[PDB]
Amino acid sequence: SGLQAYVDSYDGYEFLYPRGWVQVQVEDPVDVVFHDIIETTENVSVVVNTVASTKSLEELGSPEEVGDRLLRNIIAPSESGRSSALIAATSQKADDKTYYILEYAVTLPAQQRHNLSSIAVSRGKVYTLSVSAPEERWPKVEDQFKTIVSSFTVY
Amino acid sequence: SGLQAYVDSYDGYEFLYPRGWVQVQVEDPVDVVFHDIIETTENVSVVVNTVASTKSLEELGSPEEVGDRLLRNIIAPSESGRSSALIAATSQKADDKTYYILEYAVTLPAQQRHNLSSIAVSRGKVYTLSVSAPEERWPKVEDQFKTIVSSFTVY
Ligand SMILES: [Zn+2]
Ligand SMILES: [Zn+2]
Ligand SMILES: [Zn+2]
Ligand SMILES: [Zn+2]
Ligand SMILES: [Zn+2]
Ligand SMILES: [Zn+2]
Ligand SMILES: [Zn+2]
Ligand SMILES: [Zn+2]
Ligand SMILES: [Zn+2]
């Protein structure tokens, strides 16, 4: 609605994101980050990694199992200061692709953050779009952020 | 998606609701109730009341103020056994109409229930669609129930 397309035919995906967000240039494996001019905390981001003959997202595990691993390994690893909580893990299908959809909280010593990610495999690569807001702002942004996350298409 | 239209041109409104729900015949001011065959707890319902020259929903108050009143007077009144909690109150516009959207919890000695309602005025009448699920089931039904509530159109 007040959203704006990002189409990346190099890397093979698109999403909508809010109008008036601007891109920050970051390092691999993160492909794009866009964040709010004012609330630079609120952002969307796409990660791309590769994989040996993992044709499908279902062979990585169930969405909960994938969720657990995303948080274990990538979002709240090691001791990165930060703790995390998996809220919900579910699946969608759009075109002939399964996406896994994960909702999680992240605390970072403490500012608490609320997130939603969509993961989908295609062409030997895993694609994770992730949107994120301060806990305080979640309820206000929840329905926009669900439109962002469900606008994610991998070719 | 797996939803089915109810169009009431007598009373001047429509909504989508899940396929395989069936109608229960109830008394005024409730116009329609539909509920799940198995989980007869899960339901959608439309209430219709009249009003003297209240042309608009904005003149009843802000959405929070309306929320407070819906719960005070209609959903958890008097001592009806039951207690209630207003979670969120927001507004939408579809066609040239403002709808108020309210999320609330209701406890009933105790089974806890989670609800979402849309209220809109037109033609000297207030229209409240309300969908409701056991707390346990909320997360599973949340996104379907938001499609139900946002499919509500008053003419
Ligand atoms: Zn790219
Ligand atoms: Zn902004
Ligand atoms: Zn687990
Ligand atoms: Zn949260
Ligand atoms: Zn919610
Ligand atoms: Zn009717
Ligand atoms: Zn059912
Ligand atoms: Zn109040
Ligand atoms: Zn609840």
What is residue B77's three-state secondary structure? coil
For residue A87, give the chain B residue with the closest CA. B139
Give the distance between the most distant pair of CA atoms in chain B.
42
Q: Which ligand has the nearest atom to the CA of A64? A: 3
Under the phi-then-psi rule, with left for phi > 0, alpha for psi from -120 to 50, and beta for the rest, what region is A53? Answer: left
DSSP A38-105: S-TTSEEEEEEEE-SS---SGGG--HHHHHHHIIIIIIS-TTSS-EEEEEEEEEEEETTEEEEEEEEE
For tokens 């033609």, what's the residue? B123
Chain B residues near residue A143 by CB distance under 8 angstroms: 146
Q: What CA–CA distances, in Å, run from A86 to A42, A44, A51, A102, B72?
A: 19, 18, 24, 8, 35
CA atoms of B152 and B7, how far apart (whole Å): 10
For residue A31, say whether it is annotated as part of any ligand binding site: yes
Q: Hey, are the CB atoms on A143 and B139 less than 8 Å from each other?
A: no
CA pseudo-torsion sign A85, A131, A7, A151: positive
Residue A83 CB coordination number (10 Å): 15
CA atoms of B26 and B44, how far apart (whole Å): 13
CA atoms of B144 and A146, how far apart (whole Å): 13
List chain A domain ranges. Answer: 1-155
Task: Please give the distance, rounded to the nearest whole angstrom, from the Cα atom of residue B40 to the centre of ligand 8.
Answer: 31
Amino acid identity, position B22: V
The runs of H, that is alpha helices, within chain B are: 63-69, 138-150
Nearest to B144 by CA among A146, A46, A67, A28: A146
H or E, element range at A139:
helix A138-150
Which numeric CATH code is attached to B1-155? 3.40.1000.10
Check: CB of residue B21 under 8 Å from CB of residue B33.
no
Task: Please give the distance, rounded to the nearest whole angstrom, from the Cα atom of residue A29 to the centre of ligand 9.
Answer: 37
Amino acid identity, position B20: G
CA atoms of B35 and B127, how far apart (whole Å): 19
Residues 55-94 of A with CB under 8 A from B: 88
Nearest to B13 by CA among B43, B44, B37, B39: B44
Closest-CA distance, A148 to chain B, in angstroms, reads 14
Documented resolution in Å: 2.8
